Amino acid sequence: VSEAQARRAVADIFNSTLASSAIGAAWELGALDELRENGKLDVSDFAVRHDLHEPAVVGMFTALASVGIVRREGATVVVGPYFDEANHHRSLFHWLNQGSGELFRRMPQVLPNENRTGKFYQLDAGAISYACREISERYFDPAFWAAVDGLGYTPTTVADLGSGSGERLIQIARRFPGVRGLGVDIADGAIAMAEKEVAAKGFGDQISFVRGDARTIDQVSARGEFAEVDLLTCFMMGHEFWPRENCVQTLRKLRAAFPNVRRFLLGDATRTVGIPDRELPVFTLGFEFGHDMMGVYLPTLDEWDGVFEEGGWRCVKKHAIDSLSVSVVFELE
């Protein structure tokens, strides 16, 4: 390449950083929904309506425009050639930046081994939760509902491992009005958020929550309710069960603690293999590099496939997700 080509490529990498951050912010502030409905927007009007500092609002749209996501026309912003694609994956940009940005920013301090004890990185939990709701819905739901449609029975008590916001249990209780639900989450803040949200939607008597580590599910006290659970779900946290030996034992413990579970629906993103560096798709690099930074194991799809029998489960159906890196839903029994 020429020096001019390198110059353009490096300027684009710099601007991409600002656009990337802006995709999450623009989602969250309501701009991308406006642009997807009407195809355009007036930046002063948008700034007044949402009581935002207009000079910053101009930067945000400029940052998006600098890489072809939107176009600026006088007072107006219109959707650019990459709008649909960036909008589709906006929760992933949110996750990377608003949720995870401080991890990546602190690369020089996170990488040194002597630094890597106790609290050594900081995520924004609320922001991660904010993004995870759309990540679940947008990428996981169709496979999730296809698995639910093919259960071959009607659930009476469902337990969700890593229940977070409580939304999955709420949706299951809408599909199956008899159903009792039980969410396990390790984070007491998620427990508080979930109990609150469930109560406001009218489900406080049907759905309840317990703080607990699903890696040590054999220690969770939930008034003997686990024995009545006949459906188990776990989405977007199963990599936490790994390394392999930890995972085998966690699966057996799940198997013994939920002895009346018929189907166990397990959904997660996985570590890819042999994608060429210049062909990496959205998410993949951030998912893998981030967990490598945090010290968290990420299995491949073949590692999952290979653990289940030893774990006490049989995989009877598998669904490919489009495309949140390489992600899947397993139907286990």
Ligand X SMILES: O=C(O)[C@H](O)Cc1ccccc1
Q: Is 85 in the site for its own copies (CB under 8 A)?
A: yes
Q: Is 257 in the site for ligand SAH (CB under 6 A)?
A: no
Q: Is 318 in the site for ligand X (CB under 6 A)?
A: yes
Tokens of 194: 């979930």
Tell me which residue has tokens 């062909």.
Answer: 279
Cβ proximity to ligand X, 150 vs 189, nearer residue:
150
Q: Is 139 in the site for ligand X (CB under 6 A)?
A: no
Cβ proximity to ligand SAH, 136 vs 327, nearer residue:
136
Q: Is 239 in the site for ligand SAH (CB under 6 A)?
A: no
By rule CB under 6 A, what string of x and - marks binding of each residue 27-46 to ligand SAH? --------------------
Cβ proximity to ligand 56D, 46 vs 93, nearer residue:
93
Region label for 234, one of left (φ > 0), alpha (ψ between -120 and 50) or beta (otherwise): beta
Paired residues of 268 in beta bridges: 328
**Could you tell me the CA-to-CA distances from 103 to 26, 127, 136, 236, 294 in Å, in that order?**
21, 13, 22, 19, 8
Number of residues that bind Ca ion (CB under 5 A): 23
Tell me which residue has tokens 């759905």.
Answer: 207
215 near 237, Cβ under 8 Å? no
Identified binder of its own copies from the candidate list 37, 53, 153, 200, rule CB under 8 A: 53
Rounded CA gap, 198 and 201, in Å?
A: 5
Identified binder of ligand 56D from the candidate list 18, 29, 52, 128, rule CB under 6 A: 128
Rounded CA gap, 35 and 31, in Å?
A: 6
Tell me, what amino acid is at 74? G
Of ligand 56D, ligand SAH, ligand X, none, which one sits near residue 268, judging by CB under 5 to 8 A according to partner kind? ligand 56D
Tokens of 222: 């939930």
Cβ proximity to ligand SAH, 83 vs 130, nearer residue:
130
Stretch that binds its own copies, among 47-55, 173-181, 197-205, 248-256 (CB under 8 A): 47-55
